[PDB]
Amino acid sequence: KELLPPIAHLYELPISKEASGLVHRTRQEISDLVHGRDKRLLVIIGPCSIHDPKAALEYAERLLKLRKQYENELLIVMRVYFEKPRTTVGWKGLINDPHLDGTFDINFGLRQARSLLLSLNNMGMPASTEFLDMITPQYYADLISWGAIGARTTESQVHRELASGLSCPVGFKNGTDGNLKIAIDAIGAASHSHHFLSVTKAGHSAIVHTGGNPDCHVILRGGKEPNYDAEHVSEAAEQLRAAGVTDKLMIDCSHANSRKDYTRQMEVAQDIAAQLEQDGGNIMGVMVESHLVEGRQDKPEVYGKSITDACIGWGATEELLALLAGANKKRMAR
Amino acid sequence: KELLPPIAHLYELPISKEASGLVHRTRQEISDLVHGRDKRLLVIIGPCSIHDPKAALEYAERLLKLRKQYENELLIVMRVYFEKPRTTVGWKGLINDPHLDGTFDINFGLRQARSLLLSLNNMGMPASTEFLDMITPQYYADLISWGAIGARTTESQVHRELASGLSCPVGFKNGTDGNLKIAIDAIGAASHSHHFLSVTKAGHSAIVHTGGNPDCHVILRGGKEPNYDAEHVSEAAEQLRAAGVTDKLMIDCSHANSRKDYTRQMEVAQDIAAQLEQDGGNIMGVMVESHLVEGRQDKPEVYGKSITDACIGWGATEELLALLAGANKKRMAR
Amino acid sequence: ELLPPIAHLYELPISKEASGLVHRTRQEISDLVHGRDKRLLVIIGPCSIHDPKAALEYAERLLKLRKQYENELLIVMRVYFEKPRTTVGWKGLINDPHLDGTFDINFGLRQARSLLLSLNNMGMPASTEFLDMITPQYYADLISWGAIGARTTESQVHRELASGLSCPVGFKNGTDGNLKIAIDAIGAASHSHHFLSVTKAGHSAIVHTGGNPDCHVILRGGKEPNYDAEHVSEAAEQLRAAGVTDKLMIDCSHANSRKDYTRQMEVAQDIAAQLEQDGGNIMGVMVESHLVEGRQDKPEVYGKSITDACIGWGATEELLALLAGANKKRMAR
Amino acid sequence: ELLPPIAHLYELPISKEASGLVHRTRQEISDLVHGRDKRLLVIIGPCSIHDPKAALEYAERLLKLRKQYENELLIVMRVYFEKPRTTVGWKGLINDPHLDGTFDINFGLRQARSLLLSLNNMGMPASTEFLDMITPQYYADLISWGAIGARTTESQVHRELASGLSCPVGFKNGTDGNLKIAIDAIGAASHSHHFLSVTKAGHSAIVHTGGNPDCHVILRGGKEPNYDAEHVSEAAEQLRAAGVTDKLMIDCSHANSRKDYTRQMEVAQDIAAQLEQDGGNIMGVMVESHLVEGRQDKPEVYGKSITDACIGWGATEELLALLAGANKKRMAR
Ligand SMILES: C/C(=C\P(=O)(O)O)C(=O)O
Ligand SMILES: C/C(=C\P(=O)(O)O)C(=O)O
Ligand SMILES: C/C(=C\P(=O)(O)O)C(=O)O
Ligand SMILES: C/C(=C\P(=O)(O)O)C(=O)O
Ligand SMILES: [Mn+2]
Ligand SMILES: [Mn+2]
Ligand SMILES: [Mn+2]
Ligand SMILES: [Mn+2]
């Protein structure tokens, strides 16, 4: 079917001066955290997946007040995930199937994704996403301040290639059974120049030569056992230094680290707060799955409630952010 | 140099009637093995990587005689791997860097890949490869009788999507630390229809809708420990049946099953031969890394010797194939 | 970077109403071309579009007359986006929409399509000269009738283009008065051709056209004007000799008015007299008309041509009334 | 599907020798166009190429004379791949290379590029009429001189094309004899244009050309022939009035021979007499020549035109010897 090239969307939705400045400055600010120049905590927080732009904008408006309130302690960036990896089969996200009905209206999905990202940046909320697909990034990447390569794709050479040409900092996740070495290896790969095939803004395949991404880091997201605690952070930092890459890392509160209880995210955050208060020198960030309303649902019946992984709700989000701000204020003073 | 689209190569190197027939029949023959309709053993055998077409053709000519000799017991298909996944960085194969000098002459690489595959199929030798890149398959897939998705990419949704649209049977490998469930999950994914972005024969990005691949199976290739033995095969078969997919599987002699020691492939093959002789009902295939000359080398100084993973040499190859043919002859008679 | 036709089609898909109007107008014109209906096709409007707002106001006025005269006249607006220059100069709204030498062709194509969609949606079918080879994929679906210009009628690439258009096409006599090139052009464009063109996705491709069975000639003057009965009669003889339709269109403007917009009425009066006496070979006329008469070098005055001089709105009413009255009589015979 | 230019360029890259010949020939011709050298450019060869074998044999014979006469004549072969028809008919080797209505354009472009590369590699530069808008990207790098035809000289899209070509371009007078269209064409093509075209990758794009400073006119007859001293003198006055080069080319064939190949020699003799008397405004001639004289509808006889009738090889030797002798005298004055 009849795919519009990136230039069609760029024409309708050009990046504004304000969005461009926010992206540029947020990428910079994050690089500073990755390389230990600033001790604020990056907080990648928001829905597991975007399925409704209206709810995402309402969430963003609430989060913006806290982004501002905590700006001396936290760098808050919203989760705006358009692409979802499934264990076998399922809904792959807003771009692949925006109408949530198996119509796969990808032209509409890319348009809606770009539109939402532009609105978010224009209101002052920077955005993050997982880069899963090889061809979709040309459509919206200019609006992304931080990227994840997922646990299921961190070992993949084509994903490492992709990351090597992205202009935002990138977090590589440990593997789904807990293998951290694949993410450490991934920084090594993505930091170098690569030559590979990719698709241009005009929608044509081409040979690209990337310059390498100097702003990669790992993310601890659990495996067979969770890996959030001080012992695990310390072990990861040793391995990072041994490989000659940044020993500043991010901890995902959700997924394998919270296991089967989405409310465990608060426990993980409390453990992280305690680390920050004792020492926590190797922590530069955290990820939290948060929405307007807690939990999850198979069908999009309740407004502001995840249709993918379960999330904490708004009230818990306030507590979690206050907790982390208070703890990091102390780390920063020390 | 701009990227030539698939149609340029197809124009210069159209598939012949003979090649087309060999591919069609070999794919069918393999499907029969995958689904338990024939008890011959698929043997995916040849170099770790192709770096010299002249040596590959000489290898193929030798292997053809054994392909014919053993055709009632074994279905022999050559390893013709053009794309290599690296742990961090390194030579990614003949397509990416055909001159082996960091010039990345991908147009020449794709041409040379297609030319070699056409010559192989024309001489009567079917071909196999790992499908790693998303855009390169349109150049040569029509000449491939069996595909692998690698241990490092089996969990990747974009690779499962790719496999779902391939016209050849596909083997998914267990993960690098030994996780089999990701390959079982991968069959589940790739057997279904997907919608995703891909590039057309004219070199333009497009939305593709695949029909699913009914001929996927798993490959046991070792993890932290090898997984070739009867116990492991039996456990894998139970898990396959539980997931409702084919419980016929393939066993890689090389890689983590030989602990990266080419001299151990024969031991693995002997264990497999013993399984076939005792029962071995769930085995439909094996993989072997084999070349004209054993071992490996960093620079392509010695003719017919691998520059990637170490391989057994031609003499050991004869013993290994005779061993497997004799063992499977007995299984087939039972 | 040039956006492909599909980008514009996505933003501005043809509506059911526009699609029906185009389809039916093309049919109606085919009927005139082949002598099945005796209404007079009237291709009327600005020499060139340079301001969509004025074009929409003009269209709204013309629509009332299109409806009023529908039993005698088939009124279709001139919506010309591409202009052939003698040497160099402004080539039209698509090539340079901001009229300042910035050549914002993406904006120009968008604006052309948008205007054409709005016109068809309001009930006013559109005509244009097809000059460029690649631009038609952007808006052709919204055009009910096309012209191949005097300067391009003899060109094989223009005859190829016409052969694949889904609308009727008028070919003009050459700039010094040669009619045979337009007769030859019908011959060419009526047949199937294979040639290179660009797809809706913006890629070059081999196209195989089916031929255009609805082509006709247009008399637009040469060294001397050619609109009179004698000239029409001579043209019709030549058309029959070549085995093509002997129903033709007469341009009031250009070489036939000797570039004097005040003479278009005189030409129309001559045509009216032909229709009243006999005028069996006439199926249409062209008139260069705008809100305000004359022309100007710079787009200072609203609704006034920046290319060839046009008659104004008041003269347009008189001219259309004149032609409707004359053709009512022809049709009654 | 249509292969983009890059596919053909990959298989048939221009050689160093071909590249040098093209570069130097274009410069040599520019020198003639602007009156810096008094050699006579001779564009000579088949009306159309339909068989590459015969073209290469022709070229080998012509090369000897190219060399022999190099101090008096600059000989460039006619290698025409695109033909304008009066109505319908075979459009040339690119459009239908198998001459059977299969329209194998991919094969045609390949064969065109291959022949041009072989010709340049053997030392014979090439000329062609540029008719089609998309084909030139495939082979233009191998062309030393281009014609815009009589039927397309007035066409703005052809003037745009010429403005971006890297070779000198001759514009022909119109088919009824109008020279002003070609003079106007130089004015147009010498300026910068913006328009749509297709890239080497096969995608449509906006191009901005720099203008072509090496354009000139070609006298090719009209209703009457226009090759004589009086006509040359009158053309030169008009060229100076328009501020463009008053050095022109004279086509021996077409309407100057009244479509009679046996009259090309008479025209050449008239031109020779002009060169001997004065003939200061003449920089070139065109001649339709093949291995064997005449024409045929089907390609039955080897080396005989299937389009316009040509003189044969023997007559070609006489004609070249005549022009060399005459120009040797002009150059000595
Ligand atoms: C799938 C994912 C996280 P991971 O790649 O760690 O499983 C997510 O944020 O939804
Ligand atoms: C890298 C590879 C196999 P695996 O994907 O099991 O590591 C190979 O055949 O070279
Ligand atoms: C240039 C033109 C008409 P023609 O092609 O008869 O000169 C026009 O309608 O503006
Ligand atoms: C068609 C042509 C010349 P002209 O464009 O003067 O009619 C030719 O050389 O074949
Ligand atoms: Mn999640
Ligand atoms: Mn290997
Ligand atoms: Mn006009
Ligand atoms: Mn000719």
Amino acid at D290: H
Question: What secondary structure letter does DSSP report for A290?
Answer: B
C254 is known to lie in a ligand binding site: yes
Binary contact (C204, D4; C-beta < 8 A): yes
B54 is known to lie in a ligand binding site: no
CA B38 to the chain's CA centroid: 19
Atom from ligand 4 closest to the CA of residue D78: 9
A62 is known to lie in a ligand binding site: no
Q: Say how far apart CA A176 and CA D314 lie, in whole Å.
A: 84
Report yes or no: D186 and D217 within 8 Å, Cβ to Cβ.
yes
Binary contact (A89, B188; C-beta < 8 A): yes
Q: How far is CA C48 from CA C28, C45, C84, C257, C307, in A?
A: 25, 8, 11, 17, 6
Q: Say how far apart CA D160 and CA A161 lie, in whole Å.
A: 43
Atom from ligand 3 closest to the CA of residue C84: 1
Strands A195-199 and A205-209: antiparallel
To the nearest whole Å, the CA of C9 is away from the closest chain A CA by 10
Q: Which of B106, C157, B204 is nearest to D1 (CA)?
A: B204
Q: Which of B120, B114, B93 is nearest to B105 (CA)?
A: B93
Instruction: Indicate the angle between helix axes B181-190 and B230-242, nearest 10 degrees.
Output: 40
Give D240's contacts (C-beta < 8 A, 6+ positions apart). Answer: D246
HSE at residue C228, side-chain half, CA atoms within 13 A, is: 5
Q: Please return the burial class of D260, using the count of CB atoms within 10 Å of its CB with bins 0-12, 13-18 and 19+.
A: exposed
Report yes or no: A67 and A100 within 8 Å, Cβ to Cβ.
no
Dihedral-angle region of residue A168 (phi above 0 means left; psi in -120 to 50 means alpha; beta otherwise): beta
Which chains sit next to B, with 3 or more Cβ pairs under 8 A? A, C, D
Q: Report the residue count for chain A.
A: 334
For residue D175, the ligand closest to its alpha carbon is 4
Q: Say how far apart CA A167 and CA D86 lie, in whole Å.
A: 58
Which chains sit next to C, with 3 or more Cβ pairs under 8 A? A, B, D
The residue contributing the CA closest to ligand 4 atom 9 is: D47
Amino acid at B248: K
Chain A: residue whose CA lies nearest to D202: A204
Q: Say how far apart CA B15 and CA B291 lie, in whole Å.
A: 26
Question: What secondary structure letter does DSSP report for B256?
Answer: G
Please give the structure tokens belonging to residue D285.
Answer: 């001639």
Residue B200: count of CB within 10 angstroms of its CB: 18
To the nearest whole Å, the CA of C5 is away from the closest chain A CA by 10
Q: Please return the burial class of A279, using the count of CB atoms within 10 Å of its CB with bins 0-12, 13-18 and 19+.
A: middle
Asked if B205 has any chain A CB less than 8 Å from its own CB, the reply is: yes
| Interface mutation target, options A11, A204, A205, A207, chain D, most CBs of D under 10 Å | A204
Q: Say how far apart CA D325 and CA D26 lie, in whole Å.
A: 24
Q: Which of B175, B278, B182, B264 is nearest to B234 (CA)?
A: B278
Q: Say how far apart CA D209 and CA D136 lie, in whole Å.
A: 15
Amino acid at B47: P
Q: Say how far apart CA C301 and CA C303 lie, in whole Å.
A: 6
Q: Say how far apart CA D163 and CA D113 lie, in whole Å.
A: 22
- Stretch 102-121 of chain D: residues touching chain C, C-beta under 8 Å: 103, 105-106
D8 is known to lie in a ligand binding site: no
Decide: D47 in ligand 4 pocket, CB within 6 A.
yes
Binary contact (D203, C202; C-beta < 8 A): yes
- Ligand 4 centre to CA of D280 (Å) is 25
To the nearest whole Å, the CA of D90 is away from the closest chain B CA by 25
Question: What secondary structure letter does DSSP report for B174?
Answer: P
Segments in chain A forming alpha helices (H): 6-12, 17-34, 53-69, 106-123, 137-140, 157-165, 181-190, 230-242, 264-278, 314-333
Please give the structure tokens belonging to residue C10.
Answer: 């996505």
- How big is the CA angle at B231 (ends B227 and B234), to the nearest 5 degrees? 100
Residues of D in contact with A202 (CB under 8 A): 203
Decide: D220 in ligand 4 pocket, CB within 6 A.
yes
Q: How far is CA D141 from CA A301, C238, C330, D66, D214, in A?
A: 64, 44, 60, 21, 16
Q: Say how far apart CA D112 and CA D94 lie, in whole Å.
A: 7
To the nearest whole Å, the CA of B123 is away from the closest chain A CA by 31
Helix, coil or strand: residue A32: helix
Give B252's contacts (C-beta < 8 A, 6+ positions apart). Answer: B173, B219, B220, B221, B222, B286, B287
Q: Please return the burial class of D314, using the count of CB atoms within 10 Å of its CB with bins 0-12, 13-18 and 19+.
A: exposed
- Which helix (DSSP H) or strand (DSSP E) does residue A76 occupy? strand A74-79
Q: Which residues pair with C171 in a beta bridge?
A: C148, C217
Chain D: residue whose CA lies nearest to A203: D203
Report yes or no: A279 and A242 within 8 Å, Cβ to Cβ.
no
Please give the structure tokens belonging to residue D153.
Answer: 């000289």
Helix, coil or strand: residue C259: coil
- Ligand 1 centre to CA of A150 (Å) is 6
Q: Say how far apart CA B78 and CA B146 lie, in whole Å.
A: 10
Asked if D223 has any chain A CB less than 8 Å from its own CB, the reply is: no
- Which helix (DSSP H) or strand (DSSP E) does residue B236 occupy? helix B230-242
Q: Which residues pair with B283 in a beta bridge?
A: B249
Amino acid at A11: Y
Please give the structure tokens belonging to residue B277.
Answer: 């002789």
| Beta-carbon pairs below 8 A across chains A and B | 136
- Which helix (DSSP H) or strand (DSSP E) does residue A172 occupy? strand A170-173
Asked if A155 has any chain B CB less than 8 Å from its own CB, the reply is: yes
Q: Say how far apart CA A147 and CA A156 lie, in whole Å.
A: 16
Asked if A202 has any chain D CB less than 8 Å from its own CB, the reply is: yes
Q: Say how far apart CA C233 and CA C226 lie, in whole Å.
A: 10
Q: How far is CA B332 from CA B324, B326, B327, C304, D309, in A?
A: 12, 10, 9, 91, 77
Atom from ligand 3 closest to the CA of residue C152: 5
Residue C250, phi then psi, degrees to nearest 5: -120, 120
Q: Say how far apart CA B265 and CA B289 lie, in whole Å.
A: 8
Q: Say how far apart CA A284 and CA A249 lie, in whole Å.
A: 6
Q: How far is CA C186 from CA B122, C42, C146, C170, C239, in A?
A: 52, 20, 13, 9, 10
Give C60's contacts (C-beta < 8 A, 6+ positions apart). Answer: C122
Asked if B65 has any chain A CB less than 8 Å from its own CB, the reply is: no
Q: Say how far apart CA B218 and CA B182 lie, in whole Å.
A: 10
| Beta-carbon pairs below 8 A across chains B and C | 3
Q: Say how far apart CA D1 and CA D14 lie, in whole Å.
A: 24
Residues of B in contact with A100 (CB under 8 A): none
- Ligand 4 centre to CA of A96 (Å) is 56
D324 is known to lie in a ligand binding site: no
Is the C-alpha dihedral spanning D216, D220, D221, D222 positive or negative? negative
Residues of B in contact with A136 (CB under 8 A): 197
Give D60's contacts (C-beta < 8 A, 6+ positions apart). Answer: D122
Give C326's contacts (C-beta < 8 A, 6+ positions apart). Answer: C271, C272, C273, C275, C276
Q: Where are the domains of chain D?
A: 1-333
Count Cβ neighbours within 10 Å for each residue of C298-327 and write b for 16 or more, e otherwise. eeeeebbbbbbbbbbbebbeebbebbbebb
Taking every pair of Cα atoms in chain B, the longest distance, rounded to a whole number of angstroms, is 59
Q: Which of D12, D145, D170 is nearest to D78 (CA)?
A: D145
Q: Say how far apart CA D262 and CA B194 lie, in whole Å.
A: 70
Question: What secondary structure letter does DSSP report for D310?
Answer: B
Question: What secondary structure letter does DSSP report for A311?
Answer: B
Report yes or no: D249 and D279 within 8 Å, Cβ to Cβ.
no
Report yes or no: B194 and B158 within 8 Å, Cβ to Cβ.
no
Report yes or no: D239 and D249 within 8 Å, Cβ to Cβ.
no
- Stretch 164-193 of chain D: residues touching chain B, C-beta under 8 Å: none
Of C1, C10, C106, the CB nearest to A4: C10
| Interface mutation target, options D1, D12, D137, D203, chain B, most CBs of B under 10 Å | D1
Is the C-alpha dihedral spanning B178, B184, B186, B190 positive or negative? positive
CATH number for domain D1-333, candidates 3.20.20.70, 1.10.730.10, 3.30.70.360, 3.40.50.2300: 3.20.20.70
| Interface mutation target, options B1, B4, B105, chain D, most CBs of D under 10 Å | B4
- Ligand 2 centre to CA of B151 (Å) is 6
- How big is the CA angle at D71 (ends D68 and D75), to the nearest 5 degrees? 65
Q: How far is CA D314 from CA B163, D256, D310, D311, in A?
A: 67, 21, 12, 8
| Interface mutation target, options C102, C191, C204, chain D, most CBs of D under 10 Å | C204
Q: Say how far apart CA D331 and CA D333 lie, in whole Å.
A: 6
Please give the structure tokens belonging to residue B142.
Answer: 């029509």
Residues of C in contact with D3 (CB under 8 A): none
- Which helix (DSSP H) or strand (DSSP E) does residue D172 occupy? strand D169-172
DSSP calls for B260-311 = T-GGGHHHHHHHHHHHHHH--TTEEEEEEEB-SS-BB-SSS-STT-BSSS-B
Method: X-ray
Is the C-alpha dihedral spanning A62, A66, A69, A72 positive or negative? negative
Report yes or no: A155 and A186 within 8 Å, Cβ to Cβ.
yes
Chain D: residue whose CA lies nearest to B9: D7
Instruction: Indicate the angle between helix axes C180-189 and C229-241, nearest 10 degrees.
Output: 40
Amino acid at B123: M
Count Cβ neighbours within 10 Å for each residue of C67-91 and write b for 16 or more, e otherwise. eebeebbbbbbbbbbbbbbebbebb
Helix, coil or strand: residue D155: coil
The residue contributing the CA closest to ligand 2 atom 10 is: B48
Please give the structure tokens belonging to residue C241.
Answer: 């000799």
Report yes or no: A228 and A222 within 8 Å, Cβ to Cβ.
yes
Which residues, judged by CB distance below 6 Å to any ligand atom, belong to the binding site of ligand 3?
A: C 47, 84, 149-151, 172, 220, 254, 308
Binary contact (A195, B135; C-beta < 8 A): no
Q: Say how far apart CA D323 and CA D321 lie, in whole Å.
A: 6
Amino acid at C223: K
Of B96, B175, B192, the CB nearest to A89: B192
Q: Say how far apart CA C199 and CA A2 lie, in whole Å.
A: 12
HSE at residue C69, side-chain half, CA atoms within 13 A, is: 26
Please give the structure tokens belonging to residue D244.
Answer: 């463009």
Q: Say how far apart CA C113 and CA C129 lie, in whole Å.
A: 15
Q: Please report where in the chains the tokens 């391009």 appear, as a residue.
A: C152
Helix, coil or strand: residue C97: coil
Segments in D255-312 forming alpha helices (H): 264-277
Segments in chain D forming alpha helices (H): 5-11, 16-33, 52-68, 105-122, 136-139, 156-164, 180-189, 229-241, 264-277, 313-332
- Ligand 5 centre to CA of C89 (Å) is 60
Residues of A in contact with D201 (CB under 8 A): 204
The residue contributing the CA closest to ligand 2 atom 6 is: B151
Q: Which of A195, A167, A228 is nearest to A26 (CA)?
A: A167
Report yes or no: D285 and D252 within 8 Å, Cβ to Cβ.
yes
CATH superfamily of the domain spanning A1-334? Aldolase class I (3.20.20.70)
Q: Say how far apart CA A113 and CA A110 lie, in whole Å.
A: 5
Beta strands in A174-235 (DSSP E): 195-199, 205-209, 216-220
Q: Say how far apart CA B236 and CA B253 lie, in whole Å.
A: 16
Atom from ligand 2 closest to the CA of residue B287: 9
Q: Which residues pair with D196 in a beta bridge?
A: D206
